Design an enzyme around this catalytic site. Structure first.
Site: not given
Ligand code: HEM
Ligand code: HEM
Ligand SMILES: C[C@H](O)[C@H](O)[C@H]1CNc2nc(N)[nH]c(=O)c2N1
Ligand SMILES: C[C@H](O)[C@H](O)[C@H]1CNc2nc(N)[nH]c(=O)c2N1
Ligand SMILES: CSCC(=N)NCCC[C@H](N)C(=O)O
Ligand SMILES: CSCC(=N)NCCC[C@H](N)C(=O)O
Ligand SMILES: [Zn+2]
Lengths: 411, 407
Positions: A108, A285
């Site tokens: 992350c 993303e």
């Protein structure tokens, strides 16, 4: 033992002592690296040690290690385990837990934010309908009208692994995929199998290219049930381009709230199989992976056509060219609608600062390079140039298998 | 024991068994992954020799034959008395081709078996080295139609008689720090560029000055030499639509030839073994031109394009990066110098992987190096699980000579 990591662009070296506090295995050996592999009923026996470590960590962080409140809590958990076989986390321990799981999440890049997490305790929940209500509240609180706030909702922990709470969705909001008989897919191919399940559980599918899927929800081990997120709760952004006026005519939109619902939260040995969490999107993303993967919406070609690029030879870099436009369009759209999104330059830079600060204060920051580096423009982000050390700390978010593979249907 | 690697874009699954012949160590443990770190005796030698010869003889379908056994004896006797041994030519060639084959950071291995090996083991002087090098450079360049090649100087002996090319590549640009605090030329070569001047080189002190070769034979002090300019094929960089692009004054050389690695075959160390192939476009356009610690030109290219450099969220660096890279590929193609773009190269490497899987049982690959530094996930390699391990023969890094050599 100390370990060094160097940034090759600035020459900053860092010393990791935190990897020392790690026990879970990596998949790697002295003879093989599985650094790029995607995926490389607990006894009282091994439960108290896991409890003890956690509470030792918790109590160190609040600066109460060895205190009477620390000892009494150990003794109490210890007793509760022998008596009942499991144990309950205080609210404080759950919050600390979920914050640390995020903090330790090495794949992350958004962890600079780890200490700001709204934790919603859903451990009093008993039914699917209760789940739906908890989730709607999460989605509304986190959306915040476009000013996204990070949040997690934590349902009751596993007991005998026969009464699991599970969110069958991989994310709370995600678009249906529908395989047509001619072999093409309508909507998101990532979601075809789940979509079919929904349909088989009685969902009437609009069958369009951006149908928000119903929540499919499992409480206390019972068969799951379907529910529609109220549309007014699902914030969505129509996609346009700052200079290409035909871009809007591509018919694209995306949802603003990414909220992962398929992972398991481990804290002090306890397993929470339903713990959806949400933050916000880094542009790539959507613009690189969701739109442009060959196995996703795969729009490079049609955008390429519309830009009339030389598509006849790859060395025109027409793909690379369409990809940047599409990504400018995503960020432009989100910003114009005042929905929180972060670009990959800003995100990676932030992360470098977070990582450095983490080494200085914590003695490490485990990180998965393969995942932290964005899927376009790798080396023009500072993470590409950052050596990282990847290892497994708890608390942690872990993968778990899809519940339709494990679930015992009660019918 | 047997490992699977999956491609997530295509669902193809491959079984690796080649890793169980892994010899060297990776840097990783069960507790830590070092996947992204850049650099993680008579008795010693015979095992290594035997292991290499067994694979060599198995490769020629003569494993266990009398030919095989005799050679094992002959090399064994030679070690036992001389404490080292010499490779047959056929073994030298096979070793080199396999060192490339096993290079897990090389996306270009589909090419592996077409390698021209030049045996320079009879070389004795830096002049000799320079002559071998120029013949290498000329052969491999081939007027733009590049051909792969390695030249192998004599193997290490007591490690006080080492042959070394001090350049890190045969052809590279100089780097001068300035009173301005800035850097002129390639900042990556700044320190070598000094050692050259500290050695007599007259730097023309511009932006793209081909460095002098600095060669060390038999462990002696190394010596400067200027590659005949006519042997250095270079490309001026223009854009197929930005007329102003040429005004940036950019050029690159056609031949990448890695000169600082150590080739290890059957336990023998060849510390001078320059090898060369050809460029994938991104090496130059993304890394050499845009790395902030290299030519770092994104700033200026963005200006010429009149992009909004006000906020990072305009993706102006990304826009420029693309054009810069269209230009490089375009320039090389226009001038007929061989070059490969990252799309075509990764597609080929996926095909190589699948060849090696069904043919050899595996193919060691380092995902962190194989995935191009632009457009990662639109290249198929992004979606490919790879297993990284260390097979021999191999190319290894070795210390810079100046940190080592005693004058
Ligand atoms: C604050 C905004 C955030 C940003 C920009 C961010 C960014 C990202 C990105 C880009 C990825 C890679 C995801 C992919 O490629 O599929 C990722 C992975 C991940 N993030 Fe964050 N994140 C954020 C917040 C959070 C939160 C709130 C959590 C949980 C509390 C979290 C936990 C994780 C985990 C566990 C993964 C790995 C998922 C996997 O292995 O598939 N992140 N993040
Ligand atoms: C023929 C065309 C070739 C292509 C397109 C190619 C491609 C590449 C690329 C893109 C890299 C990463 C380099 C970097 O980022 O610095 C690389 C590294 C490497 N290549 Fe290949 N290569 C080729 C030929 C060769 C040959 C002929 C050899 C040796 C016989 C070789 C051995 C290696 C090795 C050992 C590395 C890793 C070196 C390091 O750690 O810097 N390559 N190659
Ligand atoms: C095989 C490979 O590891 C796989 O494609 C990974 C690579 N890096 C990634 N990185 C992110 N952030 N998300 C991903 O899905 C992936 N996929
Ligand atoms: C720290 C990190 O390992 C380093 O930046 C690597 C990443 N991948 C790379 N990949 C290639 N092909 N070449 C490189 O120089 C690097 N650098
Ligand atoms: C908890 S939200 C963290 C995040 N920023 N991303 C998560 C994964 C989202 C996925 N990659 C998608 O494209 O929908
Ligand atoms: C042996 S040639 C293999 C290759 N194509 N590159 C090797 C390293 C060159 C470096 N990336 C550069 O940009 O000069
Ligand atoms: Zn590893």
């Amino acid at each position: 033992r100390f370990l060094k990591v160097k940034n090759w662009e600035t020459d900053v070296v860092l010393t990791d002592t935190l990897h020392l506090k790690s026990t879970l295995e990596t998949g790697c050996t002295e003879h093989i690296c599985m650094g790029s592999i995607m995926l490389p009923v607990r006894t009282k026996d091994q439960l108290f040690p896991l409890a003890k470590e956690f509470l030792d960590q918790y109590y160190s962080s609040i600066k109460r290690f060895g205190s009477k409140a620390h000892m009494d809590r150990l003794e109490e958990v210890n007793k509760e385990i022998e008596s009942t076989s499991t144990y309950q986390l205080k609210d404080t321990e759950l919050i600390y837990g979920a914050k640390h799981a995020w903090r330790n999440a090495s794949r992350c890049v958004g962890r600079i934010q780890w200490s700001k997490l709204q934790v919603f305790d859903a451990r009093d929940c008993t039914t699917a309908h209760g789940m739906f209500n908890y989730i709607c509240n999460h989605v509304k609180y986190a959306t915040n009208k476009g000013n996204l706030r990070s949040a997690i909702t934590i349902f009751p922990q596993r007991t005998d692994g026969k009464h699991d709470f599970r969110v069958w969705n991989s994310q709370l909001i995600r678009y249906a995929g529908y395989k047509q008989p001619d072999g093409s897919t309508l909507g998101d191919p990532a979601n075809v199998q789940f979509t079919e399940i929904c349909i088989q559980q009685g969902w009437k599918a609009p069958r369009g290219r951006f149908d928000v899927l119903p929540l499919l929800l499992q409480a206390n081990g019972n068969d799951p049930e379907l529910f529609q997120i109220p549309p007014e709760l699902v914030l969505e952004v129509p996609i346009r381009h700052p200079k290409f006026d035909w871009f809007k005519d591509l018919g694209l939109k995306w949802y603003g709230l990414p909220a992962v619902s398929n992972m398991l939260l481990e804290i002090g040995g306890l397993e929470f199989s339903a713990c959806p969490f949400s933050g916000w999107y880094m542009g790539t993303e959507i613009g690189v992976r969701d739109y442009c993967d060959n196995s996703r919406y795969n729009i490079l070609e049609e955008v390429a056509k519309k830009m009339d690029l030389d598509m006849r030879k790859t060395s025109s870099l027409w793909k690379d060219q369409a990809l940047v436009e599409i990504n400018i369009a995503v960020l432009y759209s989100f910003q114009s609608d005042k929905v929180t999104i972060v670009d990959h330059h800003s995100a990676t830079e932030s992360f470098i600062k977070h990582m450095e600060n983490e080494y200085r204060c914590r003695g490490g920051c485990p990180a998965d390079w393969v995942w932290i580096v964005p899927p376009m423009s790798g080396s023009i982000t500072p993470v590409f140039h950052q050596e990282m050390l990847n290892y497994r700390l708890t608390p942690s978010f872990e993968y778990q298998p899809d519940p339709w593979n494990t679930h015992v249907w009660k019918g």
